[PDB]
């Protein structure tokens, strides 16, 4: 045998943690991605990219730290340590938000290594790899928001930062400037994810209460752990129950377990389509007919028209410090207020 | 509208009980997806004899 | 001429039909509000 | 208010075209049962 064959069979030993060809992309990239988040949310500042503090060394707690984004003038720059901005200086590199990109890109290739790992593992045991396919819903979300979306904006500064309060901020930001709740694709995302949680609770409960071996002692001697269950309950008692409660039930176990896979995944995919649409600031912001009808008759008032006023507020009062590079100054007589209507 | 005006006055994102809720929902979706994928590759075929108004004797 | 032997019948049962129609009408109801804007 | 005719037709074809595809496929499946 040649050295290649010897390498290949070293990588696929039965052992506690599986290395594999996929491991070579996954493990260093994952370590550096994760570890960069940690070293940065403990030490690295953002006084120079946003005018904030965001690390423990400065004062902050677990919810208010973050590794934050670059400044707006940096463009879509890679932010290489050897690039023509840092020039081989680890301090400036930390100061310019250069390691947000480090984390992001290393985590993206860590994602890629994980899905390959799922393929070749599943190839080894010789089963269909549906879980690798399910896992491309998280990849879709990741790349459409953390990579594609600010690449449609003017800079990475409008990308979300890795941190709890920073992404709470992302929520309120999108609410204000895109009115993201009124977009049919996010509605389809909400329906999908909530339906996943619905199937999860209903299935667990139904199965746990149609168990075989409720009387005499277990006549089930295996698992056989890779079977999950499905042997341990009676399809007929559950199907008969739900045909009377709800009036429709599944009569095929395989199709039930396929529905549970379909729902959250199509869910994530649709919300991905919507947010890659927001990346060119095409917004289902308003119904044209409602605006006309409100202009001509100003006693018309809708829960929707209220949401527009509130979002105007979010934008106007949050902008100067969320975009401190624009230098917004709003005299207080120009800001919007309820008592002024 | 209810969601927006509720966050404004009670600041619920920073309230832990909603956070345990969000964790439950993302976790529910995750475990739903995983359970479906694992079982639906494992199963080869199932069968039960079926008669003219009921189901059979061995759910195989 | 002589028959193609790869010709296969297509099947569709009633429960699938009900889901499909549910899908058509429910998407239609979600998107009619944007189609009229 | 506005009443698009284009909106009327957009919804009309969106609900008529796939539904007729569906019912044709069913009605020619049932005739293969005998």
């Amino acid at each position: 045998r040649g050295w290649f064959d010897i390498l290949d069979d070293w990588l696929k030993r039965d052992r506690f943690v599986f290395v594999g060809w996929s491991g070579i992309l996954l493990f260093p990239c994952a370590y550096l991605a994760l570890g960069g988040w940690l070293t940065g949310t403990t030490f690295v500042t953002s006084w120079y990219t946003h005018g904030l503090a965001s690390s423990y060394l400065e004062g902050c707690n677990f919810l208010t730290v973050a590794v934050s984004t670059p400044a707006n003038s940096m463009g879509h720059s890679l932010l290489l340590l050897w690039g023509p901005e840092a020039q081989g200086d680890f301090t400036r590199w930390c100061q310019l938000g250069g390691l947000w990109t480090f984390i992001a890109l290393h985590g993206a290739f860590g994602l890629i290594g994980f899905m390959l790992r799922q393929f070749e593992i599943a190839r080894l045991v010789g089963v269909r790899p549906y879980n690798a396919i399910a896992f491309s819903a998280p990849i879709a979300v990741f790349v459409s928001v953390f990579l594609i979306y600010p690449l449609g904006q003017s800079s990475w500064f409008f990308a979300p930062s890795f941190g709890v309060a920073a992404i709470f901020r992302f929520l309120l930001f999108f609410q204000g400037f895109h009115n993201w709740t009124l977009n049919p694709f996010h509605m389809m995302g909400v329906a999908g994810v909530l339906g996943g949680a619905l199937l999860c609770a209903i299935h667990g409960a139904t199965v746990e209460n149609t168990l075989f071996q409720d009387g005499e002692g277990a006549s089930t001697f295996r698992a056989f752990n890779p079977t999950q269950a499905e042997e341990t309950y009676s399809m007929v008692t559950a199907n008969r129950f739900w045909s009377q409660i709800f009036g429709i039930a599944f009569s095929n176990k395989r199709w039930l377990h396929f529905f549970m896979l379909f729902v959250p995944v199509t869910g994530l995919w649709m919300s991905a389509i919507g947010v890659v649409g927001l990346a060119l600031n095409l917004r289902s912001y308003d119904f044209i007919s409602q605006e006309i009808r409100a202009a001509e008759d100003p006693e018309f008032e809708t829960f929707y028209t209220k949401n527009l006023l509130l979002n105007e507020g979010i934008r106007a009062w949050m902008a100067p410090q969320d975009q401190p590079h624009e230098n917004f100054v709003f005299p207080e007589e120009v800001l919007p207020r309820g008592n002024a209507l | 509208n209810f969601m927006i005006v509720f966050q404004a006055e009670h600041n619920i994102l920073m309230h832990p009980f909603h956070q345990l809720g969000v964790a439950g929902v993302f976790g529910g979706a995750l475990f739903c997806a995983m359970h479906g994928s694992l079982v639906t590759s494992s199963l080869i075929r199932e069968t039960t004899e079926t008669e003219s108004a009921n189901y059979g004797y061995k759910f195989g | 001429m002589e028959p193609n032997p790869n010709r296969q019948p297509v099947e569709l049962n009633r429960t699938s039909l009900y889901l499909g129609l549910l899908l058509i009408l429910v998407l239609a109801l979600l998107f009619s509000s944007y189609f009229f804007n | 208010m506005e009443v698009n005719q284009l909106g009327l037709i957009a919804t009309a074809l969106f609900v008529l075209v796939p539904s007729v595809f569906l019912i044709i496929l069913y009605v020619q499946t049932e005739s293969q049962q005998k």
């Binding site: 009036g247 | 189901y55 | 549910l22 009408l25 239609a28 009619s32 009229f36 | -």
Partner: peptide, 28 residues
């Protein structure tokens, strides 16, 4: 013409409910 469309498509959903409950396949 818009309100008509809303209520019509809803009318169709409840008819779908009725048939899917009382006229479903036999389990064979």
């Amino acid at each position: 013409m818009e309100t008509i469309t809303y209520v019509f498509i809803f009318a169709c959903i409840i008819a779908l409910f009725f048939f899917a409950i009382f006229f479903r396949e036999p389990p064979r």
